Amino acid sequence: MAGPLSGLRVVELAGIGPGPHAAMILGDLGADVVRIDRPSSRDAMLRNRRIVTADLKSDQGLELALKLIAKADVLIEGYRPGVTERLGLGPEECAKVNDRLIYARMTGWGQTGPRSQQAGHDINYISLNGILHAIGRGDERPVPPLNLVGDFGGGSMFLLVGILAALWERQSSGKGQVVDAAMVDGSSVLIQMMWAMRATGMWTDTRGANMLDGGAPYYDTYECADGRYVAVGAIEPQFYAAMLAGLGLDAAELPPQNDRARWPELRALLTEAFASHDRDHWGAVFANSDACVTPVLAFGEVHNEPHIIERNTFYEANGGWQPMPAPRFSRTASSQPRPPAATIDIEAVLTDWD
Amino acid sequence: MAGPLSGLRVVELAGIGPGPHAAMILGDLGADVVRIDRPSSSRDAMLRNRRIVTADLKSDQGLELALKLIAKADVLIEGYRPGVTERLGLGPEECAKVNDRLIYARMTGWGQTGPRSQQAGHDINYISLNGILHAIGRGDERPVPPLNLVGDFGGGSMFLLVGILAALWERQSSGKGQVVDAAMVDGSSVLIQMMWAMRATGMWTDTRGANMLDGGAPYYDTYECADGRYVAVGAIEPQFYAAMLAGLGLDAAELPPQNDRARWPELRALLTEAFASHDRDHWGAVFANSDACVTPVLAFGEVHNEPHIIERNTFYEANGGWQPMPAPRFSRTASSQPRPPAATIDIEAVLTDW
Ligand SMILES: C[C@H](C(=O)SCCNC(=O)CCNC(=O)[C@H](O)C(C)(C)COP(=O)(O)OP(=O)(O)OC[C@@H]1O[C@@H](n2cnc3c(N)ncnc32)[C@H](O)[C@@H]1OP(=O)(O)O)c1cccc(C(=O)c2ccccc2)c1
Ligand SMILES: C[C@H](C(=O)SCCNC(=O)CCNC(=O)[C@H](O)C(C)(C)COP(=O)(O)OP(=O)(O)OC[C@@H]1O[C@@H](n2cnc3c(N)ncnc32)[C@H](O)[C@@H]1OP(=O)(O)O)c1cccc(C(=O)c2ccccc2)c1
């Protein structure tokens, strides 16, 4: 198996959202990933796995599972607190059969506290810690950033950092431990820059009035003549100057880049400029530029973008394109993901593993 | 130094955004983090858990001090355009000669090669190219940037972290380091792999504001309350949706079906009128301890008053401002409270200590 995590062994108890995403990235980087689902696969998030079923409520299902776990490095579970305990797959049961196991618990609200038993999804976790309120236009209700910030960014990715930091700690101590990854925590660390900026008077709680939330005319999207969009991210004054020259705009006509009181007016001037040509035109004009102006591509166009094609950021599978592994490694390179490995028998795996 | 990454030694060539966010988290988890800034130069909490040092790397003495640190360290982080470290004398090849155990971590937006590899850019630019930006915001309006959460951090720093830590695990076999190439355009593509999966199997359109998780579903969105503040609704599962309806006072019999997309306009109007009839804190009461997946959308400034946030110590206080505590959490080797940014140190003192 290709990648820096060759021969890492990972047991995944099937769930949704973050736990499966973390398992995927582990797979992607060469880990041996076995996912236990329940007797009751077309999701490419299940790439780079062996799938096995087992009623974990049965006596045998439990016993089989504990044999897997005994032979593994990492266990991932993404159920509400208490769930794995009741199955007899809790951290303490696992530590009897393998004091080396990294026990990885993926929740939204965490392991304890008043909301620990509440159902939730991404939108709920990011609502509570200030993140969701900060996203969208000011004259309007907050908009969910898909499920990128709670499930993945502040979720799976923190589970991963935890699984791999604990594997490092293990090398010097010989012992596993429990990783408690809560989306409400990770997503808060994910947005630490805003907490830093608010502390130094450089971020408000007003939506749509900030450097990076879309309120700044040099950090936003603009509609073009054809109804498609560009993104502008020209924060540094020299990039900003370069953009203005490429728009045909004389800097003397315009309010200061960072006079926030005149942003409305600046925006109107830039709006009229971008509107006068189509997206492709601006993509051309600004190629090789430090003006920080890029075409906003829809998913279906991404496969036609030179920089995407030539770095092979995607590969063709199945119905269509999928992201290749990340990040990239010079010596032990990941390989192209294996499609979801149709259900094998949990005994097979055990023989294969000893 | 507390945390699972105790012992880990890290050199960070000062940059902006992902590079320092990665460095911070390593610090957060116990790593020993030394940051080399240029002398043309702390109230940014993103530079917590650091020793800072000065050094002109353009000078001959600068370079060789730098090169000593690198020799005695496990990890190098740099986030400059490709070719910059080379032309400084700090490239991978030069580093591999004073320390072949080094994890050489390269944080960019566009990657190390290809047509955009020298273009300046920010978060909004990298997510504009891979389909992400286009998918965020309401359907009748231009895309809205999800702050810099998806490119810089979730799809940037966090992949840098996984790469560093995956390579550290690899260096337990081979005894040799390697080059980690983390590009935001790639990492953020893996961050959104779910949408690429659903797109392949007909469960996600390219139409902004018309999907299950982008705000198009009346049961996964925010709603404005009587007081002009908001709640989040994430009631995807039918059981949770039913619980929400009951709390709202709406009879399922009078509403269109939850997933009859063609009648979402009606459904949304009904839910809109219901949520609008009481204030956010009413709904907060009604639904606490419920599985209805309704939470208050708090602003940053109110987060410190939320019981579940307080009790799990998701935040700590520092220098007039709350800041996030490290994530994730570890049962045995817990992280400490982060130390504030430390006034500078002489690069000699550090080489001694090491
Ligand atoms: C955008 C969105 C997301 O945000 S995904 C992230 C959702 N949040 C979390 O994951 C946080 C932690 N987990 C939970 O809070 C719950 O898991 C629950 C999701 C609320 C469901 O609650 P429940 O259904 O009540 O489950 P539970 O955790 O309470 O326990 C159920 C268990 O089932 C039993 N058993 C488990 N394995 C087995 C087995 N092998 N054999 C037999 N039984 C098993 C356990 O014993 C336990 O049962 P109980 O004893 O306690 O009954 C998101 C992201 C991605 C996808 C989705 C979709 O919904 C979706 C759907 C279709 C297409 C695309 C997406 C949503
Ligand atoms: C939301 C937003 C973000 O998205 S942040 C992420 C931006 N993207 C990246 O980071 C990816 C890779 N990097 C770059 O593409 C460039 O770095 C550049 C920043 C575009 C432009 O930088 P340039 O100014 O051209 O620098 P360069 O990297 O090409 O080369 C600079 C070098 O400087 C020299 N030298 C370095 N160290 C030393 C030293 N110790 N002594 C002497 N010289 C040194 C090198 O030699 C080289 O110079 P040259 O030889 O080539 O001249 C974001 C995130 C966070 C913050 C911000 C803010 O802007 C902000 C600002 C204020 C408050 C709050 C936020 C924005």
CATH number at residue B17: 3.40.50.10540
A239 in B contact zone (CB under 8 Å): yes
Report how far apart the first and last C-alpha atoms of chain A are (Å, whole number): 18
Residues A144 and A265 in one domain: no
Strands, DSSP E only, in chain B?
9-13, 32-37, 51-54, 75-78, 103-108, 178-183, 220-224, 230-234, 294-296, 315-317, 322-324, 329-330, 342-345
Give the whole-angstrom CA distance, residue B132 versus residue A146: 9
Structural domains of chain B, count: 2
A226 in B contact zone (CB under 8 Å): no
Q: Is B79 exposed, middle or buried (0-12, 13-18, 19+ CB in 10 A)?
A: buried
CA atoms within 13 A on the CB side of A256: 4
Alpha helix (H) residue ranges in B89-229 = 92-95, 123-129, 158-173, 184-191, 193-200
Residues B225 and B344 in one domain: no
Q: Is B145 exposed, middle or buried (0-12, 13-18, 19+ CB in 10 A)?
A: buried
In a domain, B179, yes or no: yes
Q: How far is the CA of B213 from the centre of ligand 1 (A)?
A: 17
Cβ of B152 closer than 6 Å to ligand 2, yes or no, is yes
Cβ of A212 closer than 6 Å to ligand 2, yes or no, is yes
In a domain, A249, yes or no: yes
- Tell how strand A328-329 and strand B178-183 pair up: antiparallel
**Quick check: B14 and B36 in contact, CB under 8 A?**
yes
Report how far apart the first and last C-alpha atoms of chain B are (Å, whole number): 14
Asked if B155 and A153 come within 8 Å (Cβ–Cβ), the reply is yes
Mapped onto helix, strand or coil, the DSSP state of residue B353 is: helix
CA dihedral over A318, A319, A321, A326, signed as positive or negative: negative
Q: How was this structure obtained?
A: X-ray
For B34, phi and psi rounded to 5 degrees? Answer: -115, 125
**Quick check: B137 and B150 in contact, CB under 8 A?**
no
Nearest protein Cα to ligand 1, atom 40:
A38
Give the whole-angstrom CA distance, residue A314 versus residue A325: 9
Residues near B342 by Cβ (< 8 Å), separated by ≥ 6?
B50, B51, B52
**Quick check: A293 and A286 in contact, CB under 8 A?**
yes
Residues A151 and A236 in one domain: no
Give the whole-angstrom CA distance, residue A284 versus residue A288: 9
Asked if B193 and A45 come within 8 Å (Cβ–Cβ), the reply is yes
The size of chain B, in residues, is 354
Touching B: A residues 49-88, CB under 8 Å: none
Q: What are A20's two structure tokens?
A: 């499966």
In a domain, A4, yes or no: no
Closest CA to B163 of B207, B107, B234, B215: B107
For B344, phi and psi rounded to 5 degrees? Answer: -60, 165
Residue type present at position A120 = G
In a domain, A197, yes or no: no
Closest CA to B151 of B7, B346, B21: B21
Give the whole-angstrom CA distance, residue A123 versus residue A115: 15
Q: How many CB atoms lie within 10 A of CB B317?
A: 10
CA dihedral over B327, B329, B332, B338, signed as positive or negative: positive
B230 labeled binding residue? no
**Distance from the Cα of residue A185 to its chain's centroid:** 14
Residues B184 and B60 in one domain: yes
Give the whole-angstrom CA distance, residue B6 versus residue B335: 10
Give the whole-angstrom CA distance, residue B139 versus residue B148: 21
Chain B residues inside the 8 Å CB shell of A171: 172
Q: Which domain holds residue B33?
A: 9-122+146-192+332-353
Q: Is B44 exposed, middle or buried (0-12, 13-18, 19+ CB in 10 A)?
A: middle
**DSSP for residue A340:** P
Phi-psi region of B189 (alpha: psi -120 to 50; beta: other; left: phi over 0): alpha
In a domain, B212, yes or no: no
Cα angle B115-B121-B124, degrees, rounded to a multiple of 5:
115
Cα angle A169-A170-A172, degrees, rounded to a multiple of 5:
75
In a domain, B2, yes or no: no
A46 labeled binding residue? no
Residue type present at position B248 = L
In a domain, B303, yes or no: no
Q: What is the CATH number of the domain that holds B275?
A: 3.30.1540.10
Residues A132 and A239 in one domain: no
Residues B88 and B224 in one domain: no
Residue type present at position B205 = T
Closest CA to B159 of B127, B136, B191, B120: B191
Q: What are A121's two structure tokens?
A: 């999804």
Token pair 């992201």: residue: A323
Residues A179 and A230 in one domain: no
Q: What are B285's two structure tokens?
A: 């009461």
Closest CA to B177 of A326, A3, A331: A331
Give the whole-angstrom CA distance, residue A12 versus residue A36: 6
Mapped onto helix, strand or coil, the DSSP state of residue B192 is: coil
CA distance, residue A342 to nearest chain B CA (Å): 17
Closest CA to A110 of A188, A195, A56: A188
Mutate to test the interface with B, among A124, A167, A197 (most CBs of B within 10 A): A124
- Alpha carbon of A112 to those of A82, A180, B298, B312: distances in Å? 10, 10, 21, 7
Give the whole-angstrom CA distance, residue A295 versus residue A285: 11
Q: How far is the CA of B216 from the centre of ligand 2 (A)?
A: 38
Cβ of A83 closer than 6 Å to ligand 1, yes or no, is yes
Residues A159 and A260 in one domain: no
Token pair 């301890």: residue: B289
Chain A residues inside the 8 Å CB shell of B289: 114, 117-118
Asked if A157 and B191 come within 8 Å (Cβ–Cβ), the reply is yes
Asked if A5 and B137 come within 8 Å (Cβ–Cβ), the reply is no
Of B254, B277, B297, which marks where a domain is finished? B297
A200 in B contact zone (CB under 8 Å): yes
Residues B41 and B180 in one domain: yes
Mapped onto helix, strand or coil, the DSSP state of residue B174 is: coil
Q: How far is the CA of B133 from the centre of ligand 1 (A)?
A: 28
Closest CA to B12 of B94, B87, B85: B85
**Quick check: B150 and B132 in contact, CB under 8 A?**
yes
Q: How many CB atoms lie within 10 A of CB B346?
A: 12
Residues B232 and B348 in one domain: no
- What resolution (Å)? 2.1
Indicate the Cα dihedral angle B50, B55, B56, B61, nearest 10°.
-140
In a domain, A196, yes or no: no
Concatenate the DSSP letters of all residues of B209-254 into one string.
T-STTTT-STTEEEEE-TTS-EEEEE--SHHHHHHHHHHHT--GGG
Q: How many CB atoms lie within 10 A of CB B305?
A: 9
The size of chain A, in residues, is 354
Give the whole-angstrom CA distance, residue B113 versus residue B182: 12
Q: How far is the CA of B82 from the centre of ligand 2 (A)?
A: 12
Residues B40 and B93 in one domain: yes
How many interchain CB pairs under 8 A, A with B? 514
Give the whole-angstrom CA distance, residue A129 versus residue A198: 14
Residues B244 and B280 in one domain: yes
Closest CA to B159 of A323, A327, A45, A3: A327
For B196, phi and psi rounded to 5 degrees? Answer: -65, -35
Residue type present at position B3 = G
